[PDB]
Amino acid sequence: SNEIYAAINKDVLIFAAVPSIEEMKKGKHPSIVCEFPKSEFTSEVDSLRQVAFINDSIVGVLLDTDNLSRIALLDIQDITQPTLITIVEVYDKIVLLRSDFDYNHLVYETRDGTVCQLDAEGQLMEITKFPQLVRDFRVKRVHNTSAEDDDNWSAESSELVAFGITNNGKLFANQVLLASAVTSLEITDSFLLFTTAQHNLQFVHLNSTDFKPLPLVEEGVEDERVRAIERGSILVSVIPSKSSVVLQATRGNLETIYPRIMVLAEVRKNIMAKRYKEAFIVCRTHRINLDILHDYAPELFIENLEVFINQIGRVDYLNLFISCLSEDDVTKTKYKETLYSGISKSFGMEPAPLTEMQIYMKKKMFDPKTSKVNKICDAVLNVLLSNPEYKKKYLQTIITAYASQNPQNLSAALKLISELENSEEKDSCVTYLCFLQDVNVVYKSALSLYDVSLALLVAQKSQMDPREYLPFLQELQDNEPL
Amino acid sequence: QRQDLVLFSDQSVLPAHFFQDSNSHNLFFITHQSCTQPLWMINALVETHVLGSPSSLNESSSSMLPSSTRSHAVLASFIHEQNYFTNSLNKLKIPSNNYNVLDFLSDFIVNNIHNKPRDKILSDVLAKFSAAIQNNPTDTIVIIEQPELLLSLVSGLTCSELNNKFITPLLRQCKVLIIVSNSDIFNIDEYDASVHSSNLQNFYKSSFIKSMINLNLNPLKTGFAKDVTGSLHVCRGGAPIATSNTSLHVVENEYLYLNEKESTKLFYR
Amino acid sequence: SGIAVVAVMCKPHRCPHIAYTGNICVYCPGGPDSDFEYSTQSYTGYEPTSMRAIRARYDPYEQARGRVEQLKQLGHSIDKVEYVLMGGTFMSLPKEYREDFIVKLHNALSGFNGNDIDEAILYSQQSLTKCVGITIETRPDYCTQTHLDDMLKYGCTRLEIGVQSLYEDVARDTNRGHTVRSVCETFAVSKDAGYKVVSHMMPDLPNVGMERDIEQFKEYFENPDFRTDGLKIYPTLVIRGTGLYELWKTGRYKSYSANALVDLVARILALVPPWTRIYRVQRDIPMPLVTSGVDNGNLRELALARMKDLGTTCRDVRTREVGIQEVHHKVQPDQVELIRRDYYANGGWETFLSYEDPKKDILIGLLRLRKASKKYTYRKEFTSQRTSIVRELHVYGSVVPLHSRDPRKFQHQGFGTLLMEEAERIAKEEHGSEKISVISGVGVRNYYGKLGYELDGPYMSKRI
Amino acid sequence: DRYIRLWRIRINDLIDDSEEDSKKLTLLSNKQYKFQIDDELRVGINFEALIMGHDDWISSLQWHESRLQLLAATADTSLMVWEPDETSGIWVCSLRLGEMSSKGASTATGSS
Amino acid sequence: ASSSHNPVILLKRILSLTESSPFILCLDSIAQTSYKLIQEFVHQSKSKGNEYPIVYISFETVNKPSYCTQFIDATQMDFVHLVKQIISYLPAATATQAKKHMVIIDSLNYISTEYITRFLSEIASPHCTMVATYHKDIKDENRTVIPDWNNNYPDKLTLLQFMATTIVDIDVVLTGTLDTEEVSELLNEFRIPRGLNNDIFQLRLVNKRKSGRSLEYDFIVNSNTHEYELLS
Ligand code: SF4
Secondary structure (H helix, E strand, C coil): CCCEEEEECCCEEEEEECCCHHHHHHCCCCEEEEEEECCCCCCCCCCCCCEEEECCCEEEEEEECCCCEEEEEEECCCCCCCCCCCCCCCCCCEEEEEECCCCCCEEEEECCCEEEEECCCCCEEEEEECCCCEEECCEEEEECCCCCCCCCCCCCCEEEEECEEECCCCEECCCCECCCCEEEEEEECCEEEEEECCCEEEEEECCCCCCCCCCCCCCCCCCCCEEECCCCCEEEEEECCCCEEEEECCCCCEEEECCHHHHHHHHHHHHHCCCCCHHHHHHHHCCCCHHHHCCCCHHHHHHHHHHHHHHCCCHHHHHHHHHCCCCCCHHHHCCCHHHCCCCCCCCCCCCCCCCHHHCHHHHHHCCCCCCHHHHHHHHHHHHHCCCHHHHHHHHHHHHHHHHCCCCCCHHHHHHHHHCCCCCHHHHHHHHHHHHHCCHHHHHHHHHHCCCCHHHHHHHCCCCCCHHHHHHHHHHHCCCCCC | CCCCCCCCCCCCCCCCHHHHCCCCCEEEEEEECCCCCCHHHHHHHHHHHHCCCCCCCCCCCCCCCCCCCCCCEEEEECCCCHHHHHHHHHHCCCCCCCEEEEECCCCCHHHHCCCCCHHHHHHHHHHHHHHHCCCCCCCCCEEEECCCHHHHHCCCCCHHHHHHHHHHHHHHHCCEEEEEEECCCCCCCCCCCCCCCHHHHHHHHHHHHHCCEEEEEEECCCCCCCCCCEEEEEEECCCCCCCCCCCCCCCCCEEEEEEECCEEEEECC | CCEEEEEEECCCCCCHHHCCCCCCCCCCCCCCCCCCCCCCCCCCCCCHHHHHHHHCCCCHHHHHHHHHHHHHHHCCCCCEEEEEEECCCHHHCCHHHHHHHHHHHHHHHHCCCCCCHHHHHHHHHCCCCEEEEEEEECCHHHCCHHHHHHHHHHCCCEEECCCCCCCCHHHHHCCCCCCCCHHHHHHHHHHCCCCEEECCECCCCCCCCHHHHHHHHHHHHHCCCCCCCEECECCCCEECCCHHHHHHHCCCCCCCCHHHHHHHHHHHHCCCCCCCEECCCCCCCCCCCEEECCCCCCHHHHHHHHHHHHCCCCCCHHHHECCCCCCCCCCCCCCCEEEEEEEECCCCEEEEEEEEECCCCEEEEEEEEEECCCCCCCCCCCCCCCCEEEEEEEECCCCCCCCCCCCCCCCCCCHHHHHHHHHHHHHHHCCCCCEEEECCCHHHCCCCCCCCCEEECCEEEEEC | CCCEEEEEEEECCCCCCCCCCCCCCCCCCCCCEEEECCCCCEEEEEEEEEECCCCCCEEEEECCCCCCCEEEEECCCCEEEEECCCCCCCCEEEEEECCCCCCCCCCCCCCC | CCCCCCHHHHHHHHHCCCCCCCEEEEEECCCCCCCHHHHHHHHHHHHCCCCCCEEEEECCCCCCCCCCCCCEECCCCCHHHHHHHHHCCCCCCCCCCCCCCEEEECCCCCCCHHHHHHHCCCCCCCCCCEEEEEECCCCCCCCCCCCCCCCCCCCHHHHHHHCCCEEEEEEECCCCCCCHHHHHHHHHCCCCCCCCCCCCEEEEEEECCCCCCCEEEEEEECCCCCCEEECC
16 A cells, blocks of 8 residues: 555664555655564574565565575564564575565565465465576466457456566566567556567567467567667556556666557546546547547447537537548557457558559548548537537537538538628638638638628638629629529 | 577577488588688587587686587688697687597698699598598588688689589588688779689689578678677578478577677677 | 847957966967957957958947848848857956847847837837847856846846866866866756756867766766756867967877777767757868868768667757758658656756657657756745746647648647646646746747746746 | 838818718728717728838838928938829839948948 | 460469470579579479479589489589480480470589580470579689680570570569668678578569560569469
């Protein structure tokens, strides 16, 4: 819970504690409370080297003789001398020691290359042996589920997996070889990160068991398997709550970056809960394509557009997003689910843009009933045009919907403009419509809707000759309507 | 910083089963720019064949004396002499008794090759190795060093006769052959050897066609630095691998190497 | 667009640090005492700006007006100009001269014809042809708090204080009047005021080896004291009139060859932190009068070939800039991300935010933020509570095209707002500040007055 | 901006009309500024003409007594006299004084 | 006309010896060696079932080819012998109704030009199919010929291009960061960079017909699955 800390001096152990995280964020300096001598529970045995914690209530210590390396355990208490619990007798020497992935038990390594796990009440069970002596290792609970991208909901049982890296820098699974030379590794929920000797940040999604060696390093990934990072930069910490990774540079300054995969996971999670405001902010502030809002689930949007409109009260936000629309599947070119589906495949092969002459077949293919843009426009139009109050709040949205088609209904836009009680408001609408489209065609439509004021008001911005619009209206303004 | 030296898919430089397969042959071709010398690689090859590991780069060299080992090694050269080979390679501690060393420089020039028919010279220079390898037939490695110089020695010899009289019989008789040479002929500034000096270059091109692996030691570009000496290239030769296993192939990578006090270091850019 | 740099000149004078050492610093060429004698120090008087200054008898009004009109007539139209001053130590001169100089330089563009500099700057705020700051050259001995207040009132935005070395014998043997360590406190006091600070270096100097040259730069970039926002590298060239030529005449001096210098530059460029802008390794020199050294017109043109042969190419701002609009938009860019770095420099924590492409390492926009400390701040604005300062806003993100679905007809006009709100987020959450301030030139005091910042003294600030 | 413009002003009973209640084409730049000053006086102001053709910023405009002429001084020391054009309706400069080339006390090129 | 309406079909008919070809020539270099095309012959000409004696006459090769059924070493024979100890294995110009075999020559660069045409005269029969590769990076020996002003005759390349009825050129497809200019340069000073000698290669086909002009096309050939793609 990040409120208890233990430090070992010689012959005494010191425990410090804080009331809460918020108090530390307020300005309460950490308070030292517990001071426990050595002769109380050990009687001056040789060594005092390491220490570890279990779920805020168990503290483990290593006491080493010439060859025997006992592990002392204490169930914590208050300031008054936390009592001793059974210390075990071990017949080997310990090298490394950590906690487990959820702060429940302890894991440790012997001087031969064997990792074993022990429980908080003297329950012992051996785990694994390593193919080569290592300098670092990490124990992780791999879910034993069967789905390749974990699309199950029964939450099947899990198994303990302990990785490792040698002094030469070769990343190892339990018994699986990985990239030849690396220098770092960090594991969190379903996530593994490691930096090779070429210093590329490479990701691993923990799906299930049966690991295999990773492929030869290649150039570029469409998914988030491979990212380029500065030289000498080892990893420091991972914060998936904000989709961030923090690392240490070689000269001694911090750095923090946000790889695309964890941001995409966050936005997908926000989508699943029918929350269309936080996802918008996340997708915008990190320069993520806005089509992914519902391009990954069209039917949900077709049924939830009525609340999509209500959740986002900013007119400009809606205008931006609807103008931010394309037709392709952003789920297949930018944000493929191959971020975590499949293992041991070929890499991204950084794509190239299409040659221009071979795109026009799609242009000639276009009909209103095929494109996503037209169906989205019709949906939002019929949703908004069912209440005059909503029109008088998103006229800009309606104009954008009209102008977001190949068969643009600019005539309807000018019809909607005509009914305003104001002149400068009509001017603002005219300017907005001129932003998206050429003034020439707008003037053509203004002529085609049989009115005189609108034509000249559009022609003001036409930047054409005075003689283009003087005599035409000077004749039109006078005669009979027929 | 330091990186391992791997030259095959089996994560081994010199596979042992190569010596265990009968009815097979293989050829390695090594080229060094004559501003540097590949001796520190010949040593590694010999150690990894005999001791089974690179005993100077990746492994310590405190027990480097492979004399009287179950394996064998045969080296022959023209550029230097028997005296240099013994004194130096024993100061480099390259074995002696489970080993064969051949000179063709000291006292060989003086009317032992000169003013004699060419056919006898070629026959005898072939018979030297044809008799020196009869003892141990299937646990030896043989390396020749810069044999093209002999072309300039024999009165009027082209690439074809020398090749078919010396090189191919040697590889047919022996299991595996390693040929090392230098490439200054391709590095004359503002002069074209393709004008009339193509006879020697024919040998290089023929060897690269016949070779299986190609090792290149080349100097740095425009300038000269302190922390790095040269560049190391590995490439697939012309001929295919004559092994019996199917998954075998060659790894493809480039190294930067520094040499200092017989100690070599390899790493990446 | 229309960014303009119009250099001006001040009347000749003598820097007083000569007084306690006897002469000018050894490498300084020319000067009033030299044969030229109508020229400010460190300039031979043969530069085109020197010619334009002499014919005007060293008057700021005429120089500024003439250069502006010439630039306008050439074919470019100007609406954003930044002034730079040159020559000696401008701050040494008496009180009235600097006031009149600044008032003239602002009234040249504003069109105003008054006095009482407060009114001049007040009118210059509401003027066309906006000014985007000044660049004043000054020495460590003249950066005291009173002078800093003067510069803040004038409208200056960034200084450039040279150090020329970090060893201690060089300071006395080059007749430069300041110990090296005092420059650190100068940087510390200057930075807390929001002044971007740039330095100078010269690789080869008398009684300096190639080694010492290497680790002096290494210590400059590594030590948390010599971390500054810019650099200039001046290879040592020997002009006949300098005190350097006497050493060569007496045989007490020798230079480097070409290979040594190109190797040194290649090594140096492979260490630059990614928040410092290497200004000019290929500086501008009086060519024919040099007697010792090597050609410097294309040093980097060969250093690049060197890094392509050793690896780890440069990472400065300049090489990674894409520009305001269509400089390298011939190809559609790649993945765009936000990168945030933090470092400790001169008794304080500072943050550098940027919008970059990580696959190919280009740069689009950047921002700098500093958390004010307690042992260096003295301004009555910054001595009332905790506060943070935006030392520089830089938006080349005025680019129309982009990668990852650029705005169609909005074309990144709200791009800067992203960074501004990003800065405000960590100002409110991490710094725990109660006031945020931004420094800027007087001509651009409105691009920041729309986001809510209100004016106090020379600063644009808003609370939390 | 180096341009000189004019504005005509009329009292009531002579103010230009047909702007209101008449089918005419109103341009963007020909707007008429009318104001009811008091219960008995209304003034109409309109734009007349654009005069240009100078090398720097205008500094002094002065009227006359017996002519429709103006005196224009620039920052280039040039002097111009602008007079009405009875033939083309757009005023053309009458006299141009100060062709001497002099900038400051020391003259190199141009004038100032 | 109504035959070989697709270039791929023509290539496969040539490869599998469906249509007889008295002479075929293949060009290669150091940038891409030419022993994969023999694999193409072996694989394609076995679908029709040609187990007929695949003689492999060799001048330089040290190893014995598994894919072939014969092995002849010609480092000790002269011209007349070399013709004579091949007519036995091959269906020599007797038995006017008989089968056809396969001939693989490892190298053409070791033979003097003076006999070239005769090596195609004493053996040319409707029973034999000569296949041989030509390395273009080896310049032959010309001191013996003494090319003075009165001792002249055409060079080997033109004779090889003339007496051939089908010509195929081999090239290595560029895949990574190497282009033709710098590749040819580095080969000139012999640095041999990575990005050479792969199985996926490219071919240029020139097929000659009687009483008419030949046809020239290009192909992309893979040596893994034995599949082809014509030039776009
Ligand atoms: S301080 Fe500047 S002006 Fe003074 S002598 Fe040194 S370089 Fe010249």
